[PDB]
Symmetry: C2
Subunit: 340 residues, 2 copies
C-alpha cells in the first residue's frame, strides 16, 4: 500500500505520499522527474494514483523521495493527470505541513525551517508552528525569471493576444484575462478553463521552452489568467490540463508573474503583494532579492500560505484492479480528458 496524508493549501489539494513509495530510478531528483515523464513504468504509476477510480479531477499526489542534498529534509515530485512536475507552491506548503504534523520532521516553535529538494532546486520553507499545528508556511521559491514579455500569438477565437512567458519553478504563459473577454470569478470557472486549454495546446505546439540549466524542466505547464481586484490584489486563475482551475492563488505562477512585475518596474526588493484565486483564497507574495539565472535577470520570490491536514488515506498498490490502468471523462475532468 501507499500511505498518504491528505492536505489542502488554501483549498487546493495536495496528497502527500509518506510511506510505501516505490523506488524511482535516478541519481538526482531531476533524473527522477525525467524518468517519471519518459519511462512506461513511470506513466503506469502516475496513472494508477491520479486517475479514476483512485484519483479525482482535483488535487495532486506528491511523492516523497529520498533527499540527496545533506541539508534537505525530503525530496518530492508532483504528480498530476498531465505529467509529473518539478515545482508547486501550494504542494510545497502541503508537504511541509504534512512532514511537520506527522512528526517525520521535528516541529520547533515558533518557527521550523524545512528544506525540500525539488527537480528545480532546494525550496527553503519557514513554518510558523504553534501547539503542534503548522499554521502557515513561507516558501523561498527557486530563482524565477522572464523568458519573454509581450509575446504575441494569433488565436482564431480572440484574434491576436499577448502573453508573458516566464519561469517560477515551472514555465508559465501569463495572460491578462480581459483579452479573452472574461473575468476571473467562480461563475466563469468552466469558460476560463476552456480558454486556458485552447491556449495551452497552441502554446505547447508552437512555443518550446526549456530551463537554460535544468534540461528536465521544459514546456509551458499552465496558462494563468491574471487581473487586479479593487483592493489591489493580483487575481489569478491557473488552468491545468485536461481542464480545471487551481483552487489556490498559484505559488509558481505568482513567482513567475512577480518576475514580470520586476522587469516592468512594478515591483522591487522588499515589496509584498496579496494574490487571490478564483475562489477567493489568498497568498502573500514577496520579492526577497534580485539574482541571475544563466546571465538572465532573475528574482527570489517568497510565497506564504496555510496548509490544513484534513485526512489520511492508504491506497492498495494492486495492479490487478480491473481499472488498474485508470480512466477519465470530460464530464468532470475537463474538455481534453478524452486524450487521457
Amino acid at each position: 500500500t501507499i500511505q498518504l496524508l491528505d492536505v489542502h493549501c488554501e483549498g487546493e489539494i495536495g496528497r502527500v505520499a509518506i510511506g510505501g513509495v516505490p523506488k524511482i530510478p535516478g541519481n538526482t531528483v531531476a533524473e527522477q522527474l525525467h524518468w517519471l515523464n519518459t519511462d512506461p513504468k513511470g506513466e503506469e504509476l502516475r496513472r494508477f494514483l491520479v486517475l479514476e477510480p483512485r484519483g479525482a479531477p482535483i488535487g495532486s499526489v506528491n511523492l516523497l523521495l529520498p533527499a540527496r542534498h545533506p541539508d534537505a529534509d525530503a525530496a518530492f515530485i508532483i504528480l498530476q493527470p498531465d505529467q509529473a512536475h518539478a515545482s508547486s507552491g501550494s504542494n510545497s506548503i502541503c508537504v511541509t505541513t504534512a512532514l511537520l504534523e506527522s512528526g517525520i520532521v521535528e516541529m520547533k516553535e515558533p518557527e521550523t525551517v524545512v528544506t525540500l529538494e525539488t527537480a528545480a532546486g532546494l525550496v527553503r520553507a519557514t513554518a510558523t508552528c504553534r501547539d503542534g499545528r503548522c499554521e502557515k508556511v513561507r516558501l523561498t521559491m527557486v530563482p524565477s525569471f522572464v523568458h519573454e514579455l509581450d509575446v504575441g500569438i494569433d488565436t482564431p477565437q480572440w484574434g491576436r493576444i499577448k502573453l508573458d512567458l516566464c519561469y517560477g519553478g515551472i514555465f508559465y504563459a501569463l495572460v491578462d484575462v480581459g483579452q479573452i473577454g472574461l473575468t476571473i470569478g467562480k461563475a466563469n470557472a468552466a469558460s476560463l478553463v476552456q480558454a486556458g486549454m485552447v491556449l495551452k495546446e497552441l502554446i505547447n505546439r508552437t512555443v518550446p521552452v526549456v530551463h537554460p540549466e535544468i534540461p528536465a524542466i521544459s514546456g509551458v505547464a499552465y496558462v494563468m489568467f491574471r487581473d487586479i481586484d479593487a483592493d489591489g490584489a493580483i487575481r489569478t486563475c491557473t488552468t491545468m490540463w485536461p481542464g480545471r482551475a487551481d483552487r489556490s492563488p498559484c505559488g509558481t505562477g505568482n513567482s513567475a508573474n512577480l518576475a514580470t512585475l520586476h522587469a516592468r518596474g512594478k515591483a522591487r526588493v522588499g515589496d509584498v503583494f496579496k494574490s487571490r484565486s478564483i475562489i477567493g483564497s489568498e497568498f502573500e507574495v514577496g520579492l526577497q532579492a534580485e539574482t541571475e539565472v544563466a546571465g538572465k535577470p532573475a528574482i527570489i520570490p517568497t510565497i506564504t500560505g496555510r496548509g490544513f491536514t484534513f485526512g489520511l488515506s492508504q491506497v492498495a498498490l494492486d495492479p490487478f484492479d480491473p481499472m488498474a490502468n485508470g480512466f477519465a471523462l470530460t464530464d468532470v475532468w475537463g474538455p481534453l480528458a478524452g486524450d487521457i
Copy 2:
C-alpha cells in the same frame, strides 16, 4: 497526525468504476429511530446538510463518488443499515453503493464472511435489500442484489423542450424515482466522447422535470422527486446501454442498479421482460451489470416487480477524514469546471 482529532473511517470501494466510500467507524449519531426518519432528517435538518456538505464537497470530497453512512440496523433481520450521501442530497437507494457496502462489510469482517456464499441483509429507507455475495479466500468477488419493489408510474410522458422539441420519458421507481429517456431523442449516442454533452442534457431535463413533475412513493413519504434522468439505448450485442446523469452534473460510472431496476419495470409493462429473464447492462465506460426479473409483486395495489442486480465491488483503499468544524472551508465548495453545469447552485 490525527492524534487528538475526531475522525470518520472509511473503506474506499468501487463498483464497476463507480466509487462508494463506506463509513465504518466514527459515524455521528443521526437522529431518527427508523432509517426512513434518518433520511428525512439528513435532507431537512441544517445539521444534516452541514454534515453532508462537509463530507462530499471540496476540499474533502470530489465530484465523483458517494459517501455511504453505515447506521444501526432497526429491522430484526438486517445486518446493517445505510444511507447514500451525494452532492445533491441523501438518497434512499443505490445498486452500486449497496454492492460497495456489502463488499466493505464482508472484507473488513464487520459481517462474518462465509464461503462459498454469504447473504447480507441491508436496511435502506426504501426497504430491505438482500445482498447475496460470492466469497472466496477472504474476497467478496461479486454481489447479487435483490432490489426493493420497483414499478412504473407512467410510460411515454410527454415533455416540451426548447432544444429537442417534445420528447418522451418513462416515470418509474427502482428504489428511487427516475425519468428514463431513449437517448436518440436528444441526438446523441452513449459513449465516453459524449460524457459532457449527455450530462448537460440530463441536467436541463432534471431541472424541467423536478419543477413540473412531482412524484412521491405511495407508502414511504421520505422518498420523493425524480433523482436522476437516465439515458438509455441498446448496444449491438443487445446490452442495455445506460447513462445516468447526477446533479450538479456528472455521469454514473456504473450501469446504474436502481435505474436498471426502474427500466426493468418498464420492460415488464411493455411485455418485453418476464419472470426469469436476464439482461446485461453496460455503462458509459463499458462496465457491466446483470439485470434479472426475479418475481412479480404489488406496491400499494399497483403492479410491480422484484429486480436483481449483479456486479463486482473492489476495495481500493482506506481513508480517515477529520471532523473539524473549524477548518476555514468547513462549509465546502464546488465549481463548474469539474462539478458540472449546475455547480453554482451548491
